[model samples]
Target chain A: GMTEYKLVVVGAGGVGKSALTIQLIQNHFVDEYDPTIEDSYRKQVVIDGETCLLDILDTAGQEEYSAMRDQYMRTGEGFLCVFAINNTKSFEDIHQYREQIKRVKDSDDVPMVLVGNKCDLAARTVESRQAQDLARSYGIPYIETSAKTRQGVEDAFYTLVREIRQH
Target chain B: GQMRLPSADVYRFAEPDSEENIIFEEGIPIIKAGTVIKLIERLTYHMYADPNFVRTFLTTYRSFCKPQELLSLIIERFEIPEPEPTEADRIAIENGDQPLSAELKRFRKEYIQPVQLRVLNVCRHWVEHHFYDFERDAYLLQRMEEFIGTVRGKAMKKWVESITKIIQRKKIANITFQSSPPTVEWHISRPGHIETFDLLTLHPIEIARQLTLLESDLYRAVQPSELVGSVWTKEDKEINSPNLLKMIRHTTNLTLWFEKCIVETENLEERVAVVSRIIEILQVFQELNNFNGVLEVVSAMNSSPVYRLDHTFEQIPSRQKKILEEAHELSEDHYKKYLAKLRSINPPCVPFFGIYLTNILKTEEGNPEVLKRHGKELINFSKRRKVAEITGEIQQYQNQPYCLRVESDIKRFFENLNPMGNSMEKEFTDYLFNKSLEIEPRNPKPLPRFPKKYSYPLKSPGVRPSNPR
Candidate 1:
């Protein structure tokens, strides 16, 4: 059966949210991209040998749109809380982001994953353990991805879709 | 839906992964840049961490720690005195029996516990205090705040970061707290906090000249993007990045001017009139071959906030709409029509510099800063050549001097204008969502307006129509 999953990529600006989403959805890696406004992308992917239609909304990470971000959080069936490994604030803000999604979904059980993107980025600020603990704290999976090498890029999307599909 | 932007593959510069390098858009000073310091420390640690023939950090400093300092430090902090024997022990000492006195245990409870707590805290502070910059400083402050159950403490820290943006020039005046302190120390997050002009008021040439200033800047900075020197381990993004952001800023200003025109008159025709005039501005931007202005205005018109406002666009005359549609096409296509017109025309014409980057990036497969050169690795001279063409073109017009009547009023108006801050834009987008949207979800037509060609990528399809620079 072909299933539909609506996933949202959320994070601060320049956190590889666009790269990750574009990487998964388009199977194309953009070396750099414009600061995204809300952009929606659709792709068909197979995870666990199950066909799925993935609709991903790559959102703006600017704090200026907290309300709009909340609306997106409300609409999404699954969320990717992405942050760059080298960006400290992006990682710090993950908690607030989770709180927003939790509040929007009104269910603590909502599907989500914490992604530390740009794993190959130099002088990485947030460590795998720190992200793992945070993900463990939120009771979801944490994966390190690099759009540079496309490592874990698909997994980040696949893992989220799988969680979303089970629900 | 008539989409305006182009294929993400084309319109977007080949930089999906670039946000990782953060010297910041405004170009943080290398001396003050946190990322640079962090990078330096990382390089330093790597240099020192291996067991190589090196003056190791532990060795370099350990040699400096005087043996005298060690004794004094241990005496001051850990003066755990030798335990004394009790009287029964004194009597039995000859008989070999003893009970320890109370002083040592008491000292361990009172003196040692506090000393150990303070010692560990000192260690914690020492380990975490490097704080490369405001971001690290602020994050450290949060951790310390969480550690001590209070907001402000001797060790509790808050970082200050201030930037005087081009948007506003004045510094804030001094202020005071109203009631001294509140229940739980206050985090006063005071995030601080535009017009339509007549179409007749603007001249294509002058508008072209003004946009060319920023575009010229983009051209000038294009070489640095081709070069590999990072200002603070990163950035002269300060140049192109800020200029592009400024271009984007003015792009938002386009909508601001349009929105104000519509809202101020309550006459939707005036909105039409304003869009016409704005379109006229866009038309000049095209003639001038100024993609920055064109991208800003066309992207502005295509902005969901502006273009998606059904009620407003409904009132726009087909002529203005046609002009805007053509503009969207121009910005999207190699603006072939305009390009053809540009080719036919002689000297002092400005072609969109972005197209230069776009064309070369396609030919080169991407504008990567470096490449292999036979037996030697070298700067991508081809990129420098591409950059040189834009710089050369700007230099061409530089001597010609765009003889725009440097009129004060509208130029002042445009200069004084800042784009809508996000708060307004948030309300602006929310305003659109609140609207009775006539258009439904659908893949849009190709650039009926090619400049915005990445058109109607709308909110879906993973690509917009042909986008301009």
Candidate 2:
């Protein structure tokens, strides 16, 4: 019998962070999704036969929440850095997100997942294979997933959790 | 049925409730404890003690029980009774104070007072009906108070104020006459009085009547010497003699009076006669070379009752055919005489005379009739042998610097002469266009100057022969 785990999603503004959180929690898809939330706690689904009580901390997509995101990153058991496959700018900002995450987390080897959302719009993809190759060189596990098709959505979260549990 | 007193058992005397003690539930007071309360109670019981209290109370209360209700109740109760007029009632009846008679008097007074008073009342009523919200009556009353103080001494101010208040309250300010000196004539002596009255009163009907009276008096006062050929002229240079101003003034007044008379009087025959008189006066002016005045008079006449009759001429009944025919003939005669006077004048110099004709003849779209009978006459005049001399003189007149300087002014004069005539523009434009075309062939390729050089010299080239000067 597997125990539940709490998952807190974090990323910069306009990085498809809210879309990923909403996808993981509600098992539903949203497009052109600009989510705005002051403060809300949501439950995530049981994945891979594991009933994980995922406390999804969805923060507002604003610059003023850097301190708050830092506080969450410090105590957060697991993290997901979401970036749109169609947005190369968001993909490039992954370093800033990773650096912030490294400062907040206690250990040097904390488990994390890099999500490339909107894989369904692959035709508009600006983050080419060379960029993903560079991201992989930083030892960040990159997964391309579409919230609409549920492709790699559950796998991405389960892989990060399994990796965390193994550690 | 013999009237029965309230049962002695039910009757009792008590002190009546004081007004302070009477608690009003809505409007009616609750019968409280008092000495005369028992008397009221007994009366109430007598009037309304049954299940049919409302009906019985209405009947008895509607009867001659109270002095205030007595007259109305009596009138209603004895609807079929032979009116045995008492001495007082008889006096009231004779004095036209009976209900039916009073209503009839009001109707008569409203419709058939002295014409001035009737007009004033109508205007007052109209203002009251239409502009009751504007509080004009109150303002007029205040003005009247001021007027009375100035003219009738300050002692009468309070009295005038009170009367004004009474008139305003009754909404009869229109018919209310202000008391002034008998010697004050509106024509000569009452400028202040007239101004004050006109400012305070909105009775256009009265104003219209007064205007008509004024016009009639003016016409009556006109000396026979003011008629045609009475004034001395300078030695036969045609004297440039134009009573254009006088003609315009007279015709304008005639039109104004005719309008007022039509508006004030409801009688068709009277309106027709007044309009005819106006036309007659216009014809007189028109015959005196007063083209502008003739135009104005014609415009006004066309708007008067005569125009209305002219429009419906075909519908005139056999009984009215002779009179209508005579009036129509008289109108046509005046019109022909007016047209003839216009023909005799120098067309270009006449002021607004042409415009008047053009406006009258203009279609709804403002286009003057091109093929009009008047247009043909102008064309014929232009082709005449005598007109050749006139044209030559006009051309010479055009060449003069004074004529050139005042070309617009001169053209404006011509434009006004036969303003209604469409051919005036074609005639003037044709002459100018043909003259310009005649001069065109000789002045072909007329140029002022040409450029000295086409291109700039290089920086190193010294002086370049002054750029091929």
Candidate 3:
């Protein structure tokens, strides 16, 4: 038997959301892999003793497309609410995105992981303690990921899948 | 009850186990590594049984075997020698005592002949579907032709001949896949004291049309990949996402240019006129559905250095003032009104790209690229699909070119926007702010009110000459 995990990625612009996705998806493949091709996004993997499929839904890049957000949120079983560690505004924007997801799904206990991206940068603005407290308050896991260097990339995605499994 | 006797030669059936020759793992059938002839013989059997397997093998077999090698092995299987019958069996068959042993007859009928036919079928399928494999390599095509020459039987020979015909047609219809040029961002022309079209002098519609046309060109020139990965925000953004950077810089310069135009005018009435003219041009921009142009004008008017001129805005007529007020709505509510307007209108339009960039960033943030479930990683294709979908939407409007012709003079004014080109951006903005204060103080005292009882004279009193006429 096989299972499917539907995950969604949401964050503000310039927050490394696409960078994280590209880094993770293109991990095993060469750097020459082009995500622009549209069709190469699907993949299968064995998890534990069982095999499963991961169906990811990425949202539109412009705020104008918020009209399409509710539809994808309804379909997503889990979410990765990302913000940059150096961007306080993006960090604050996380509240809006998270609230929207809750409002769309109408579930307080939906699986989500708070990702603080770009931990590799030397100048940090959004402190680790602040994000952890936020994650703790929501009772969701928090992971720091640098999409450029592949730090915590696997952990972030896998943690979300695990959260969905528990839910 | 009649004719209900027991059935004869009954044998119980059960689940079959893997034979010594082949095995199964994870429900997939596998064959033991063997000699080339044996492998080809088995592979040929599978090819005949499953067209899908044949297609898959033909597509993927290059990893393990060369085209020439596979063709040669197939040829060897086609010419597989028939097993000679026993002398005793031959004499028995001649005397009509018994047919040759079932082994040789079965081998020739079921295995050998079928294998030969399948070899030809596989060859035909290979050449037809993957003609490039042969076209790229002359020797492979030559080998295939030599095998086609040896092929016998009218239908089988025709099937093999179809391969030759296909190769010919493919050769005749030779096509090469050429990638289009990448949409690299164009560089800005250096700024100098070039004369610019005056906003007051030109027809507002002409001004609006030319500005929209220029912005449309800049907007459409942006490639989708430039927005991906949020590269425009990175340190090396100029190198990676130059088009996006250029568009952004052009926008900033347009804002600066608008501010410069107003504050530099020393006359209050003339500055008010400039504001009125800009508002009217914004009206034309809205009519033309140029969202990008609309935002630039709106941002310039609302900028602190320009907007602080209280005396300047004090004189703008109510009608023009109302249009400017509505223009502000396009950016309100996180662009709520603007997005609705964007969808409601038909293109050739330049959209506000920052919203798209934010959405792309949000989409990338909310989705993970790979899913790790139960300690296994799979590429999260949905995220890429989402990003690509956004890029696709951006590309959609790019195809709708603006019908307005380029006014080179106005375009040159836009291209050589000097204030933004210089490194003294902070200094220039500070200077503009000071200039704005000098033109109109932040809180200039209001004119004193006259007594209600006093009647003001409508005409000036006549002046007497020094000598009476």
- Residue-wise C-alpha lDDT for candidate 2, range B69-129, written one tens digit per residue: 3222222221211223346656787878863444334333432222223222222332332
* Maximum-lDDT candidate: 3
lDDT of 3 by residue, B1-469 (tens): 2111112222101112223222222322443222333445455662246554455456445534677888877776576554556777788889979765766766666655666677777887787766757867999888888778767766466666776677677667722323432221111211232342455544566667767877888888786546666666566667767777777767767777788888777566566767777777788788889888888888787665676677778888887788888988776434558878888888878887876775566555545554443454443433444565667678778877665555566677667767644657546766776777777764545422222221222121111112222
Question: Given candidate 3, what's the lDDT at residue A5?
Answer: 81
B1-469, model 1: which lDDT tens digit per residue?
A: 2212223344221112122322222422221112221222221221122221111211111122332342233223322233455565577666665545455555455544443344333323223321122233455434433333322323222210111121012212122433332111001111110133333333333444555554444443333223222211123445424543443344456545554443333334444544555666666665555555665566556543354445557766676688777766763322445556656754444444433433322222223343333343332333333433443444454343333333344456556665344556545544543331322211263211112211111121111123233
Q: Native contacts recovered by candidate 3, as a share?
A: 0.16
Query: Could you give candidate 3's per-residue lDDT for residues A6-125 as a string of tens digits?
Result: 788888764556666666766455442443344334456655555777766554344333333444466678999999898898899888788777755757788999999993556899
DockQ of each: 0.03, 0.00, 0.10
What TM-score, to 2 decimals, does candidate 2 have? 0.24
TM-score of chain A of 2: 0.76
Going through the candidates in the order shown, the clash numbers are 42, 18, 19
Greater DockQ among 1 and 3 belongs to 3
RMSD of each: 24.3, 41.6, 17.8
- Candidate 2 CAPRI grade: incorrect
Better of 1 and 2 by TM-score: 1
